Amino acid sequence: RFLKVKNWETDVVLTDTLHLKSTLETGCTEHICMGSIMLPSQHTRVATKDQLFPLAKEFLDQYYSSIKRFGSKAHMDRLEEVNKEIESTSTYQLKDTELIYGAKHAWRNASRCVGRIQWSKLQVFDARDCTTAHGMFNYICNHVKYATNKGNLRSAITIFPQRTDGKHDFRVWNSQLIRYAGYKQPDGSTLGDPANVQFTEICIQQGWKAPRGRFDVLPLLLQANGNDPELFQIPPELVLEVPIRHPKFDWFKDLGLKWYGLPAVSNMLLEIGGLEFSACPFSGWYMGTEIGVRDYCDNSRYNILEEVAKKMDLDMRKTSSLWKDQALVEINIAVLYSFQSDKVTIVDHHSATESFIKHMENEYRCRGGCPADWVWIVPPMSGSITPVFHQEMLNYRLTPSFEYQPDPWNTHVWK
Amino acid sequence: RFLKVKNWETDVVLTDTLHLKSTLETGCTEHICMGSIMLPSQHTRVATKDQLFPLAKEFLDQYYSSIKRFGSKAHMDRLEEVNKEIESTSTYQLKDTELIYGAKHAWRNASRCVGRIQWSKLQVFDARDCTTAHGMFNYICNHVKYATNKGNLRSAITIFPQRTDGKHDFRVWNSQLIRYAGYKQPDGSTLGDPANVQFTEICIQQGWKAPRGRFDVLPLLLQANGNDPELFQIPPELVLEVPIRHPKFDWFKDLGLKWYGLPAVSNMLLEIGGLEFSACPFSGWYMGTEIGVRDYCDNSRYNILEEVAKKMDLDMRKTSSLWKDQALVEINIAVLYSFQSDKVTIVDHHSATESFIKHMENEYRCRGGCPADWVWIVPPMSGSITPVFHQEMLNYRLTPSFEYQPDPWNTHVWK
Ligand code: HEM
Ligand code: HEM
Ligand SMILES: Cc1cc(N)nc(COc2cc(CCN3CCC[C@H](F)C3)cc(F)c2F)c1
Ligand SMILES: Cc1cc(N)nc(COc2cc(CCN3CCC[C@H](F)C3)cc(F)c2F)c1
Ligand SMILES: C[C@H](O)[C@H](O)[C@H]1CNc2nc(N)[nH]c(=O)c2N1
Ligand SMILES: C[C@H](O)[C@H](O)[C@H]1CNc2nc(N)[nH]c(=O)c2N1
Ligand SMILES: [Zn+2]
């Protein structure tokens, strides 16, 4: 009942009691493991009043347990206070203090996140007073500006008002606030970013006028209080981009690539004490592999191993010349280099995996465990030369949490 | 109840009913996933008579189901025949035909094995008539010779007699038949192979006279019918080794490395119809990463990224120069190259992962699924540029199977 995880590079052993507080299910049963299914029906996100008080209760009991007032009159009164508001309006509202707590712990509990060492250093912007798509654009712009901080990136989250009835719903329709457009061509091939070609279309549907190129920063599509979403373009001066050069190959400039400094995931759902925030964009800084490995080299993303290997003059006949591997290490040295020569915050996959282990240490010491998803923590290149390859991680789902949710244009009862 | 696995590189979907025949547990529960624990208490291996007939029954029912005689008089008679022998001796004996079947399906069901596309092409050597450590040495030598086949490697398994009482037990004490010795030094550092330093000691304990160098091929330690194990050295002429050069760097010869052609796992337990074969060494050919990535570059293995990066003249100050990644792709181009220039069978990690997907196709089509462990199927470098990174795999434990077992010197009631 008090499980043990081992590291096989260091012969280090930690004990995990934190999983006893766990609540949600994981997809796995006694007779099957779903640890590699992408979006289980568990990780995807309508709640009633009887269901709501336990969740409000359980969350408040840990929030007061964490300020050294577990069970006092401050705790009890707030328990009755929300119990009362839950009678009155069937739902309730979070204190400013409870929002910062819940927010930070959704990150802290995010088992697929390698960078959680920074979870307490998080900036919470309360956008619960927002009412229009224009209001959302203004909060989101102030977020971009703040988190970007001149490439000295800072973590932040902006929390639009919680889902209520369920049809009056705030959503950012973009996957990330900053993403390049994706355009199909005549021959079927794809200019820009193949990932977003669906979204680019709905953008031009609603009225976007695309500069049909590669690294076209998409506009924002903002849905407010259930209304139909509206297009807004972030000021270009607030979209910090990094041109990708290499510290050897002078043709790497002619490759012509660039990426945005700020990764800002916007399309997911923040759960706090049983309340659902459908729009809650959060940002940090990039790990180099997210761009150099996945973005640039996924077959169905930018797919540049073709072109890079060419310029390197590479044995591209044989599969086993390892030319793909060769051009991937070069591509990732260049992303890191380019980002660092511009003083834009980036972390290499070795630094970040080492910290996640140092992080795992503190989570097991001062918290009794740390949920972690190996499939997603291991960087997607040079896996076993990073230290997390050899660390056993127990995955389990605590709360407060971040949950996937269906895309709006599928669910949105239009016009 | 009829689950679906998706690929996210190809938008391909397969349906898995095969997991319904599954039997053993996996460590995972509804509320926690152990998918990254190395050796769960489930994967590690004493059975009685009441327990034995169901397992014999279930196995015979699939063996006859697979030769298009499900339930006939041949099936029924054999059912009564083993039921009878299970009354008489509490245990029973497998037909030559049932041994080849069970054997091949333990490989086919081995969810951590990327090369299972070859599972039906398997050569079964029946060593159940063996009685002495000398007999074991002779069967094992004939296996080495056969599977090696002049570097044109062939898959094989040799099946020593099944565990009976439990103290009369055949075991190969080596992890792999062919492994290099591991020697601690004065300063504590390790010559040879750090992994085996424990075993090298027990070898010299029992009487080995080590040529205290690096790539010293270990002797065999063979335990027969519960007796104390005995030392035998494979004839050097049967140990095919590949010197590791690079197709560029002429100092790669001066690096001075070599590896054995034949990977032959000897320390595990073959389960067939409820019967336990404690010694059952099996071999195939190497995937390049097993040597170039793990053997040569694991921190606690040969740890050569230090020395290789030097000769390349590498930015080894900064972590984020990605010099480890750089020297790992070179190291793996050299292992592959060296092995192929000697006509010794080796497979690169791209070829092998592509076949495992082609394999997964046939297992889902003509068998209804394929148990697969993502944590172990994904190669430990360049993960996301291989196609298995993007394939969802359901893990589950069928039978016949290969199981881990405790090392003998812990359990063996000595002398
Ligand atoms: C501080 C720098 C951060 C870094 C370097 C980082 C890195 C990563 C990486 C590499 C992933 C794997 C996803 C992928 O590669 O596709 C991930 C996932 C994730 N991160 Fe972090 N991240 C950071 C900050 C944050 C912040 C600020 C939040 C929320 C406030 C957060 C919450 C999450 C969540 C919810 C996931 C995905 C979990 C899932 O998909 O179920 N992270 N992150
Ligand atoms: C034919 C060429 C083969 C290749 C290229 C291959 C490759 C691999 C690899 C890369 C692993 C992961 C283990 C690690 O990297 O540490 C593995 C595991 C395994 N293979 Fe295969 N293998 C082959 C043949 C075989 C054969 C002939 C058998 C048995 C008859 C077998 C049964 C297994 C088992 C039982 C495991 C480990 C499962 C576990 O640890 O629970 N494989 N193999
Ligand atoms: C703040 C931050 C910083 C940083 N450095 N990185 C990240 C990555 O956060 C992610 C990323 C994803 C990607 C899932 N993938 C994307 C391609 C499409 C594929 F279908 C799914 C999903 C999430 F839910 C996240 F939270 C976030
Ligand atoms: C026939 C064949 C061909 C091939 N090409 N490869 C293999 C690899 O088969 C393995 C490998 C392992 C290694 C586990 N690791 C080893 C380092 C120590 C660490 F503790 C555990 C365990 C098994 F049970 C296996 F079956 C086999
Ligand atoms: C098939 C598998 O579920 C899928 O490819 C996962 C594997 N691990 C991952 N890990 C990260 N960080 N990001 C990803 O998108 C994925 N994809
Ligand atoms: C911690 C984790 O359980 C362990 O490192 C696993 C990960 N996946 C692996 N995959 C393979 N092929 N071989 C291994 O030894 C391991 N080790
Ligand atoms: Zn699981």
Coordinates of N, CA and C and ligand atoms in Angstrom, one line a residue, chain A residues 263 265 268 282-287 290 404, ligand 3:
Chain A
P263 N 5.8 29.2 -25.4 CA 4.8 28.1 -25.5 C 3.7 28.4 -24.5
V265 N -0.1 27.1 -23.8 CA -1.2 26.1 -24.1 C -2.5 26.7 -23.6
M268 N -7.1 23.9 -22.8 CA -7.4 22.9 -21.8 C -8.1 23.5 -20.7
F282 N -2.0 28.9 -20.3 CA -0.8 29.0 -19.4 C 0.4 28.9 -20.3
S283 N 1.5 29.5 -19.8 CA 2.7 29.6 -20.6 C 4.0 29.3 -19.7
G284 N 5.0 28.8 -20.3 CA 6.3 28.8 -19.6 C 7.4 29.2 -20.6
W285 N 8.5 28.4 -20.7 CA 9.5 28.5 -21.7 C 9.7 27.1 -22.3
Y286 N 10.4 27.0 -23.5 CA 10.5 25.8 -24.2 C 11.6 24.9 -23.7
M287 N 11.4 23.6 -23.7 CA 12.5 22.6 -23.8 C 12.9 22.5 -25.3
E290 N 11.1 20.1 -27.9 CA 9.8 20.4 -28.3 C 9.8 21.0 -29.7
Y404 N -7.8 17.6 -20.6 CA -8.2 17.9 -22.0 C -9.7 18.0 -22.1
Ligands
LIG3 C1 3.6 25.9 -20.7 C2 4.3 24.9 -21.6 C3 5.7 25.0 -21.7 C4 6.4 24.1 -22.5 N1 7.7 24.3 -22.6 N2 5.8 23.1 -23.1 C5 4.5 22.9 -22.9 C6 3.8 21.7 -23.6 O1 2.5 21.6 -22.9 C7 1.5 20.9 -23.5 C8 1.7 20.3 -24.7 C9 0.7 19.5 -25.3 C10 1.0 18.9 -26.7 C11 0.2 17.7 -26.9 N3 0.5 17.3 -28.3 C12 0.7 18.5 -29.1 C13 0.8 18.2 -30.6 C14 -0.5 17.7 -31.0 C15 -0.6 16.3 -30.3 F1 -1.8 15.9 -30.7 C16 -0.7 16.5 -28.8 C17 -0.5 19.3 -24.6 C18 -0.7 19.8 -23.4 F2 -1.8 19.6 -22.7 C19 0.3 20.6 -22.8 F3 0.1 21.2 -21.6 C20 3.7 23.8 -22.2

